[PDB]
Amino acid sequence: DVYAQEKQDFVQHFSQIVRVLTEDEMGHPEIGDAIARLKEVLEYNAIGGKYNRGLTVVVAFRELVEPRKQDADSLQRAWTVGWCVELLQAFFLVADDIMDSSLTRRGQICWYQKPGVGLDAINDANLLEACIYRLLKLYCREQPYYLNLIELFLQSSYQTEIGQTLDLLTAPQGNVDLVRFTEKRYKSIVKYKTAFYSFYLPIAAAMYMAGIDGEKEHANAKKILLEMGEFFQIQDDYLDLFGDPSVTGKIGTDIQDNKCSWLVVQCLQRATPEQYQILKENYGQKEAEKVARVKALYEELDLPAVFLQYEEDSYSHIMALIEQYAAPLPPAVFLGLARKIYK
Amino acid sequence: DVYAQEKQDFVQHFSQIVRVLTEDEMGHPEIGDAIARLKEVLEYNAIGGKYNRGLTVVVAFRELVEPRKQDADSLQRAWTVGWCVELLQAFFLVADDIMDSSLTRRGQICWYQKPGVGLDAINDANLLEACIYRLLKLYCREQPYYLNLIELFLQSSYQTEIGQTLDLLTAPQGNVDLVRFTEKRYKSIVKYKTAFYSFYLPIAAAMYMAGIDGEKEHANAKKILLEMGEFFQIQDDYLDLFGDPSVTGKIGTDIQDNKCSWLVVQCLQRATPEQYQILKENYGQKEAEKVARVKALYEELDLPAVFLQYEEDSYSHIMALIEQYAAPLPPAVFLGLARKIYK
Ligand SMILES: O=C(O)Cn1c(C(=O)NCP(=O)(O)O)cc2ccc3ccccc3c21
Ligand SMILES: O=C(O)Cn1c(C(=O)NCP(=O)(O)O)cc2ccc3ccccc3c21
């Protein structure tokens, strides 16, 4: 697989990414100690995940570009830009983990939870953000898509930040209100907090690198990718509760955390006044006796079937979008991504 | 005064800055609630300070530009770019306040300390950062210095972030170590965390807007401004303990907070082994009986006189730099700034 294959070269390029970002220490040894911490920040936070968003940039670049323009440098820039997406993600996860008072990320202790870190991780998160642009300058300054990538990563940060503000306003840290749990809000949080940075940003970066800078091509790609974003999160929320924790490699947290999940949204859309009250109680509770009750109400409301139906219609919808908006790009750009997301 | 005069127009432009940043709500009412919070973030965090860094951009722009090129739009962009510096500063202060577990900023409750905020202020700090670039795109996209300003604000964020990492490594939250309190470190923290963003960034922004984009002109300006930065912080640390709290409008916190202040650095440079131990005890302590002891040791070591001597040599040094590096810029750019900083 394009992904399974290149995952090695992508992860092996990280050694250079680090060497390169820890090279301004040469002229200024005065800040060596801060760069030593900056190294530790990257090693701990950019490494450990699936690298799929970062890999998408590499994969999409190969697919969008004529094989003769794929020289040593072009690929060095594709891996780098791929890494910038991972670095952007590392910056959000470090900060999101602080904000939601989390204990683990990828089964490991959250960076801020590590001794000697704590709220210093707020600065660490900022340094991860700074590196996107440091690399972008180091590898793409002379490229004609340079300004386009800076603006893309910047728009992408803003979009996520807006999404996060929306999420935070919707599900506060100790507020059992389901009035603000509307589908219009769920769809909105997903567009801003996840869909944009996870699906639009990686393909869009490759597009700019390929010379595809047109507003219409990007609008067409944005149309397709944002809908893939929407499904990804809906499936993520379904799998959170009904997924097999062996294959998923994670156990259900959603209900216990008062999350505006797709499941609750649907539950709230299809619930008798008493069923609303049953939820109004058991939601946001750490107690296994209470978590079991919601799981049971969702099941009673045939949400696994409502999800199955949604998955069918969604894949049917994405194909319609790919048909309509992929042109003039290679449909494979989108088809490859959809295959990895759907089942 | 250029400052005292324009402070009104600068502060009155903030109403537009806000209107403009809260205008993407028109096409997307779906995120209205997040923008409503985004409004509250700006009103609370960008307003309330002296606006001197922001004002420097306006003042320097007028001084660097031929009065005929100063049309409605040019000034609208100068006020905006001025505001971006304030927004950059707002982003650091919100985050620094969280990190150092502070109670007040400009005598008012810290944004994060306000009910319903807390660590959500980490995201708020990011939104303040996002706005720099949102405004930059809104007002300067079509200007030839556009990319130069994005890179400037970005380099400036990185520099401060590095400075902050350095500071955090030097003075941890409950670590009485004076081994790392060297002058080389003090000078380093000051260059990165303050001098760059406070003095280089504002003048540099005006320079780019004026067409002054040359590496040498910027190196020459950087030479002068970074030294002004160094004094500013040294005076800030002196005034922290020995300033009249009426005129200063602030009371001494430094010693109680284990800060790598200029005073301690000098105290440590000129201290008998027993004087080292006297400090090793009383420093980082909240007790007024212990804070009085350090104040008394500094006095014993004639640091107010060591500072007076430093101020004299420093002003003498800045004038030498202005003589050597201001050309071809108007020396008044630098002279005006120095007058406001020195006594
Ligand atoms: O990485 C993920 O969370 C999901 N994911 C997966 C995935 O984990 N599939 C299950 P597996 O790794 O066990 O075989 C693949 C893949 C590809 C491209 C992507 C782009 C944006 C966002 C996600 C993406 C993505
Ligand atoms: O605003 C400040 O903290 C200091 N400050 C002052 C100042 O407060 N002077 C005392 P005052 O307001 O009571 O008369 C002025 C002035 C000007 C340009 C500056 C540029 C970068 C950084 C600081 C600056 C600056």
Nearest partner of B123 among A173, A312, A74, A7, judged by Cα: A173
Distance B189 CA to ligand 2 centre (A): 20
Cα B336 from Cα B64, distance rounded (Å): 13
Q: Are B224 and B321 in contact (CB under 8 A)?
A: yes
Nearest partner of B311 among B338, B336, B335, judged by Cα: B338
Nearest partner of A99 among A160, A57, A42, A21, judged by Cα: A160
Please report which ligand is nearest the Cα atom of A235. 1
Nearest partner of A178 among A287, A255, A96, A101, judged by Cα: A255
In SS3 terms, chain B reads as: CHHHHHHHHHHHHHHHHHHHHCCCCCCCHHHHHHHHHHHHHHHHHCCCCCCHHHHHHHHHHHHHCCCCCCCHHHHHHHHHHHHHHHHHHHHHHHHHHHHCCCCEECCEECHHHCCCCHHHHHHHHHHHHHHHHHHHHHHHCCCCCHHHHHHHHHHHHHHHHHHHHHHHHHCCCCCCCCCCCCHHHHHHHHHHHHHHHHHHHHHHHHHHHHCCCCHHHHHHHHHHHHHHHHHHHHHHHHHHHHCCHHHHCCCCCHHHHCCCCHHHHHHHHCCCHHHHHHHHHHCCCCCHHHHHHHHHHHHHCCHHHHHHHHHHHHHHHHHHHHHHHCCCCCCHHHHHHHHHHCC
Closest ligand 1 atom to A249 CA: 13
Q: Which residues of B are annotated as a binding site for dimethylallyl diphosphate?
A: 105, 193-194, 233, 250, 259
Cβ neighbours of A116 in B, within 8 Å:
172
Distance A159 CA to ligand 2 centre (A): 35
Q: Is B274 exposed, middle or buried (0-12, 13-18, 19+ CB in 10 A)?
A: exposed
Catalytic status, residue A141: no
What experimental approach yielded this model? Answer: X-ray
In SS3 terms, chain A reads as: CHHHHHHHHHHHHHHHHHHHHCCCCCCCHHHHHHHHHHHHHHHHHCCCCCCHHHHHHHHHHHHHCCCCCCCHHHHHHHHHHHHHHHHHHHHHHHHHHHHCCCCEECCEECHHHCCCCHHHHHHHHHHHHHHHHHHHHHHHCCCCCHHHHHHHHHHHHHHHHHHHHHHHHHCCCCCCCCCCCCHHHHHHHHHHHHHHHHHHHHHHHHHHHHCCCCHHHHHHHHHHHHHHHHHHHHHHHHHHHHCCHHHHCCCCCHHHHCCCCHHHHHHHHCCCHHHHHHHHHHCCCCCHHHHHHHHHHHHHCCHHHHHHHHHHHHHHHHHHHHHHHCCCCCCHHHHHHHHHHCC
Q: Catalytic amino acids of B?
A: 50, 91, 96, 100, 105, 167, 193, 232, 236-237
A217: tokens are 């091509």
Ligand 1-lining residues (CB < 6 angstroms)? A 50, 52-53, 56, 198-199, 337, 340
CATH 1.10.10.410 holds for B1-343: no
Instruction: Provide the 10 A C-beta neighbour count for residue B103.
Output: 8
- The reply to whether residue B166 touches residue A120, judged by beta carbons under 8 angstroms, is no
Domain boundaries, chain B: 1-343
Residue found under tokens 């800060």 = B259
Cα A85 from Cα A128, distance rounded (Å): 11
Nearest partner of A171 among A100, A92, A91, judged by Cα: A100
A95: tokens are 């900060």
- The reply to whether residue A133 touches residue B158, judged by beta carbons under 8 angstroms, is yes
- The reply to whether residue A134 touches residue B164, judged by beta carbons under 8 angstroms, is no
Cα A205 from Cα A185, distance rounded (Å): 28
Nearest partner of B228 among B342, B306, B309, B333, judged by Cα: B342
Cα B193 from Cα B163, distance rounded (Å): 4
Please enumerate in sequence order all residues whose Cβ is within 8 A of that of A265, keeping only pairs 6 or more positions apart, or say none.
A181, A182, A183, A186
The A residues from 40 to 99 touching B (CB cutoff 8 Å) are 95, 98-99
Among A34, A163, A172, select the one facing B162 at the smallest CB separation.
Answer: A34
Question: Measured between alpha carbons, how far apart are the two ends of chain B, in Å?
Answer: 16
Q: How far is CA A229 from CA A194, A197, A318, B340, in A?
A: 7, 9, 11, 53
Q: For helices A121-140 and B146-170, what crossing angle results, to 10°?
A: 140
The CA-based angle B157-B162-B165, given to 5 degrees, is 125
Closest ligand 2 atom to B199 CA: 21
Q: Is B44 exposed, middle or buried (0-12, 13-18, 19+ CB in 10 A)?
A: middle
Cα A188 from Cα B251, distance rounded (Å): 46
Q: Which residues of B are annotated as a binding site for Mg(2+)?
A: 96, 100
Q: Which residues of A are annotated as a binding site for dimethylallyl diphosphate?
A: 105, 193-194, 233, 250, 259
Amino acid code (one letter) for A68: R
**In angstroms, how far is CA B130 from the centroid of its own chain?**
18
Amino acid code (one letter) for A265: V
- The reply to whether residue A123 touches residue B95, judged by beta carbons under 8 angstroms, is yes
**Atom 1 in ligand 2: residue holding the nearest Cα:** B52
Q: Is A103 exposed, middle or buried (0-12, 13-18, 19+ CB in 10 A)?
A: exposed
Cα B298 from Cα B306, distance rounded (Å): 10
**In angstroms, how far is CA A47 from the centroid of its own chain?**
15
Q: Is A32 exposed, middle or buried (0-12, 13-18, 19+ CB in 10 A)?
A: middle
Count of alpha carbons within 13 Å of B288, Cβ hemisphere only? 1
Q: Is B181 exposed, middle or buried (0-12, 13-18, 19+ CB in 10 A)?
A: buried
Q: Are B163 and B198 in contact (CB under 8 A)?
A: no
The B residues from 134 to 173 touching A (CB cutoff 8 Å) are 134, 137, 146-147, 150-151, 154, 157-158, 161-166, 168-169, 172-173
Q: Are B51 and B113 in contact (CB under 8 A)?
A: no
In sequence order, the β-bridge partners of residue A105 are: A108
Nearest partner of A46 among A77, A96, A87, A17, judged by Cα: A87
- A180: nearest CA in chain B? B33
Resolution in A: 2.9
User: CA torsion, points A227, A230, A236, A237, in degrees to nearest 10?
Assistant: -150
Amino acid code (one letter) for B316: S
Q: How many residues does chain B have?
A: 343
> Number of Cβ pairs closer than 8 Å across A and B?
120
Distance B341 CA to ligand 2 centre (A): 6
- CB distance B199 to ligand 2 below 6 Å: yes
